[PDB]
Amino acid sequence: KSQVKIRFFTREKDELLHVQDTPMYAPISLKRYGLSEIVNHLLGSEKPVPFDFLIEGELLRTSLHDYLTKKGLSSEASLNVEYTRAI
Numbered sequence: 001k002s003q004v005k006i007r008f009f010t011r012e013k014d015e016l017l018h019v020q021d022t023p024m025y026a027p028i029s030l031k032r033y034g035l036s037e038i039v040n041h042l043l044g045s046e047k048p049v050p051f052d053f054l055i056e057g058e059l060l061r062t063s064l065h066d067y068l069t070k071k072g073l074s075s076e077a078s079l080n081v082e083y084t085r086a087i
Contacts, residue, residue: 004028004064004075008039010083017085019043028065028075035060039083050086055079059087 003025010017019042026038036051043049053060055067060081068075 001075002027002029004068005078006064006081007078008042008081008083012084017043017049023078026064028068029063031063032060035081035083051083052085052087054082054084057082 005023006026007021007023008019009021010019012018019039024038026035030038032051032053035053036048039051040048058067060067064079065075067079068077
């Protein structure tokens with residue numbers, strides 16, 4: 001119940017901001033800051049880039065947990081998580 005499967009993608013044109021399609025598990029407690037830590041690690045960022053995250057176009061304003069609860073989904077859901085340079 002503590003983890004949820006996520007896959008990252010971006011519409012950013014900058015190739016250096018592109019991560020692989022690969023799925024991974026994330027704690028449901030994570031919010032924008034934790035998720036940005038994951039993406040910047042995957043990118044091997046020199047200096048960390050501030051990211052915002054969207055799920056099916058809705059800005060992620062709190063935790064993955066809160067999103068799942070709002071949508072009536074269990075953490076057995078697989079989430080398609082968009083990232084963008086911070087708004």
